[PDB]
Amino acid sequence: YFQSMNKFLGTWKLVSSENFDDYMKALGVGLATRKLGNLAKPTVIISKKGDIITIRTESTFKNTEISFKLGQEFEETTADNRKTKSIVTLQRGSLNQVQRWDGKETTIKRKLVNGKMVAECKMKGVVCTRIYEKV
Numbered sequence: 001y002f003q004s005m006n007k008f009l010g011t012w013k014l015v016s017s018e019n020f021d022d023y024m025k026a027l028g029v030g031l032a033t034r035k036l037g038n039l040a041k042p043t044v045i046i047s048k049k050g051d052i053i054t055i056r057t058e059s060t061f062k063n064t065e066i067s068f069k070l071g072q073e074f075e076e077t078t079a080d081n082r083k084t085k086s087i088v089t090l091q092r093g094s095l096n097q098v099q100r101w102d103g104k105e106t107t108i109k110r111k112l113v114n115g116k117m118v119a120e121c122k123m124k125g126v127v128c129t130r131i132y133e134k135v
């Protein structure tokens with residue numbers, strides 16, 4: 001008995017964001033960029049072709065896209081142009097992404113709560129919560 005991330009598949013629209021400014025600060029994002037980041041209301045599209053999962057983020061300010069297999073480290077360029085070594089895992093219904101770069105670490109845990117996808121973003125004790133609804 002192995003679970004899957006099929007429940008994450010689809011198109012997701014940001015409906016709420018809490019503490020994103022301080023999470024961006026902790027990541028090293030500069031003020032002008034945080035201002036635009038805070039105003040962004042992205043769409044996130046999670047798809048899967050065979051073993052390969054893709055997470056595409058679309059906003060006016062920044063589009064990003066990563067493609068990966070579960071549990072295999074990949075190189076990632078983030079929305080704020082960090083170049084990280086990343087791994088996405090599935091832990092008891094939660095799709096967990098860890099990004100490491102320059103001896104630093106941040107985690108984005110995405111889980112489903114009453115049909116909404118909730119992304120918890122952590123960097124050195126700063127926690128940001130972002131809520132998405134399925135389109």
Ligand SMILES: CCCCCCCCCCCCCCCC(=O)O
Pocket residue numbers: 024029033034036037038040042044057058059061062063078079080108119121130
């Ligand atoms: C497209 C996202 C907002 C744009 C702001 C760019 C500068 C900082 C963003 C980097 C961290 C993004 C983490 C998003 C987590 C998520 O909700 O999927």
Ligand SMILES: [Cl-]
Pocket residue numbers: 048049050
């Ligand atoms: Cl397929």
